[PDB]
């Protein structure tokens, strides 16, 4: 068997919150469970051992326990400024080895919606050049992320293998996304009319830009 | 056995049986010989009609024994600066442990009525707790190599005695000489026949 | 405790990797070294313990002869060979390390994962270091930038003004694209007075290629 | 299916625990779980309902949520004057009806022994009279509890019904417990010794009251 775990967690901020990881009879219960927390861009670092005995580096803050077949990780409370996932991990006398939960996201809780800007990049003639043609377009100052991007020739869609960026997180409060589009340059000049949309949840622009200038 | 007491000072060796050195004038035939590994603050309690600790949950000894233990210190082999949980020792056993047989189980032991199948309740505890072997602890918390041998009779005809002591050769003496079990006097002199090889 | 090492370089599917962790400051003769790698979006795995002590390290059920393990006295430092790589091996790795000694199976539920600290990283790859081949790209309040392409492995470094301008560059996600290739974006924000009077160029250093390009972005004709 | 909790949890004051409750994916996540609590010797009560909003008449003390197959009731702190089980409660679309967790004991973390005391009280002859003869020890000044009391004649113990009551809390922060054991009065008098004993956990004591005064 495998242990499972909460993809993510919703807690506000200055109240306990706890996180559940079911198990099974041979898991849980006989065998100890230990709770690893990782830094993002950094290392991880265990946050209790044995159920019971806290490490020494950490304030009397956090708490864990099991009780039968799902263990719990007691959160006092919760600051916005360190948001970490917790991992689940027991052993097992059949599988003979340590075996990983999922792994929980934590986030504080609104706030209103921004106004997005979308920008279209048509290549120049070194781009052309090469017997290549590619397209980019790029979305920011849009909060809160979740974004997808389709390209449109204002007739019809086109679906060459068409991707979409995930979302990523900036210094100033904002989200940023970009899609990439590579062509031929037959078809490239085919449309005098390239534009991609944005889905911000309620908001929808188009960037309409001529591949002239 | 003279290649015994060479692996350093002992710990404790007494016995109600028979001396080493007569152990090599009376041939045998059957020795029990096992091994194990206990807390030096818990060896006292190895004895006959003793209890302790461990005295019903692990190892137990009969009245009738025909040997004893012999224990040393051992630090420099299973002492780590880090930990050493290799060896455990169980405490938790429903009823009486019959002396000189071996049992292991995983099974989670219940001090009362609580129903458990594989859970730790607040009376259910497991029955194999880890021991902890650093050079911080002093002489009461280090592990004893302690093995004990038992002696059998009356199974079989006597097969295993060490050395006999054999002595060097004398030629155109009056001497006396022993064989193969083939006592008898007379004089040794080469011979011409032609033995089979059996 | 530390386990400073270098970071892991990009093999081929079907080839070797080897990542080791220098260990100092306590000997190396009673800690057992795991190796576990995390994955993205999901749990972690294991394979089996390292001994420097006796040659009694096991395996995993999954993994049988994926990994070798070779162990060493004079370094103290655990070596690492792969074998046939697969597009299930994108992940960092970190060593783990683990405190006291086990050796037989019924003693490694006490001990729990000690110390990370700066792990490498081991993926399998189709795609490989390749040289740049990247074009400036053209412009449309007013925006510019330039894209790259046809590179390996990430990541890559934009830089705008030589140095000298920081506000706004932001490094866009690149994406996994079919035969390979990556594409990290970088903009800037200019007035719309100014698009094709001030000239603007954009540095971008790869390494394990040791070229420059200098492009220099010019509008569409 | 049956929706299970563990028997009991134990967490100290001053620092928050949880209570989880495993389900299956019919019956947790597309229904709502309730959770109920009720009062020695008094009425249940519901503590919180559709998981993220609270009912009016309780502060803003607790925290319930549920995550996929388990729910967490969050418990910030607990007070030593209020011990309260918690109640799990789902609806299945199978069975379609309303099924309920078995309910968790909750307890605070230690005090040392004490000396307990046993009587024995032999019947007078008008019990004797009513062609009948039973015996009634009782134990009392003992902390903690779970003792067992068993009868002794002085040479072999007898089995003929023997019953053991459960312990019980007193308000001077004591426990007590009884036995009951009849008999007839032609084996009553068969022995002229009869008492009863009782195991403290290290504590044995027994009381020998002899058949005449």
Redesign the interface.
């Given at each position: 068997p495998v242990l499972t775990q909460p993809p993510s967690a919703s807690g506000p901020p200055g109240q306990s919150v706890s996180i559940s990881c079911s198990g099974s009879r041979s898991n849980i219960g006989t065998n100890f469970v230990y709770w690893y927390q990782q830094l993002p861009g950094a290392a991880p670092k265990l946050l209790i051992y044995k159920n019971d005995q806290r490490p020494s580096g950490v304030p009397e803050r956090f708490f864990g326990s099991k009780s039968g077949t799902s263990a719990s990780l007691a959160i006092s409370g919760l600051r916005s400024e360190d948001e970490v996932d917790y991992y689940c991990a027991a052993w097992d006398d059949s599988l003979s080895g340590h075996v990983f939960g999922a792994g929980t996201k934590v986030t504080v809780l609104g706030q209103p919606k921004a106004a997005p800007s979308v920008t279209l990049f048509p290549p120049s003639s070194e781009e052309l050049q090469a017997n290549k043609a590619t397209l980019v377009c790029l979305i920011s100052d849009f909060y809160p992320g979740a974004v997808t991007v389709a390209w449109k020739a204002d007739s019809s869609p086109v679906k060459a293998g068409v991707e979409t960026t995930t979302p990523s997180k900036q210094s100033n409060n904002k989200y940023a996304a970009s899609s990439y589009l590579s062509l031929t340059p037959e078809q490239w000049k085919s449309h005098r009319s390239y534009s991609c949309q944005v889905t911000h949840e309620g908001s929808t622009v188009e960037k309409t830009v001529a591949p002239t200038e | 056995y003279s290649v015994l007491y060479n692996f350093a000072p002992f710990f404790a060796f007494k016995c109600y049986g028979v001396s080493p050195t007569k152990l090599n004038d009376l041939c045998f035939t059957n020795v029990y010989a096992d091994s194990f590994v206990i807390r030096g603050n818990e060896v006292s309690q190895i004895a006959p009609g003793q209890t302790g600790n461990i005295a019903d949950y692990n190892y137990k000894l009969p009245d009738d024994f025909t040997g004893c233990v012999i224990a040393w210190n051992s630090n420099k082999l299973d002492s780590k600066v880090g930990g050493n949980y290799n060896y455990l020792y169980r405490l938790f056993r429903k009823s009486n442990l019959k002396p000189f047989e071996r049992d292991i189980s995983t099974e989670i032991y219940q001090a009362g009525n609580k129903p458990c199948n594989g859970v730790a309740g607040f009376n259910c505890y497991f029955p194999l707790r880890s021991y902890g072997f650093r050079p911080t602890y002093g002489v009461g918390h280090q592990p004893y190599r302690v093995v004990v041998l038992s002696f059998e009779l009356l199974h079989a005809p006597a097969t295993v005695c060490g050395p006999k002591k054999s002595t060097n050769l004398v030629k155109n003496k009056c001497v006396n000489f022993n064989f193969n079990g083939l006592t008898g006097t007379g004089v040794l002199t080469e011979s011409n026949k032609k033995f089979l090889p059996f | 405790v530390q386990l400073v090492q270098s970071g892991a370089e990009v093999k081929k599917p079907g080839a070797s990797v080897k990542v080791s962790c220098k260990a100092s400051g306590?000997?190396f003769?009673?800690?057992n070294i795991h190796w576990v790698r995390?994955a993205p979006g999901?749990?972690?795995?294991?394979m089996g313990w390292i001994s420097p002590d006796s040659d009694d390290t096991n395996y995993?059920?999954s993994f049988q002869g994926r990994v070798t393990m070779t162990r060493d006295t004079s370094i103290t430092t655990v070596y690492m060979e792969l074998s046939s790589l697969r597009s299930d091996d994108t992940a960092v790795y970190?060593c783990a390390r683990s405190?006291?000694?086990?050796?037989?199976?019924?003693?490694?539920?006490?001990?729990?994962?000690?110390t990370?600290?700066?792990?490498a990283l081991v993926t399998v790859s189709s795609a490989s270091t390749k040289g740049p081949?990247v074009?400036?790209?053209?412009?449309?309040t007013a925006?510019?930038?330039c894209?790259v392409?046809d590179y390996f492995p990430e990541p890559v470094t934009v830089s705008w003004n030589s140095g000298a301008l920081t506000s706004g560059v932001?490094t866009?996600?690149?994406?996994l694209?079919?035969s390979g290739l990556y594409?990290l974006?970088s903009?800037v924000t200019v007035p719309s007075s100014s698009l094709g009077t001030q000239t603007y160029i954009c540095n971008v250093n790869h390494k394990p290629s040791n070229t420059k390009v200098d492009k220099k972005?010019?509008?569409?004709?």
């Open positions: - | - | 306590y000997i003769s009673d800690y995390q999901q749990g972690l795995e294991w995993a059920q970190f405190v006291g000694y086990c050796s037989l199976n019924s003693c490694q539920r006490w001990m729990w994962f000690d990370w600290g700066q792990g081949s074009f400036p790209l053209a412009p449309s925006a510019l930038g894209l392409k932001h866009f996600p690149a994406v694209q079919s594409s974006s903009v972005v010019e509008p569409k004709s």
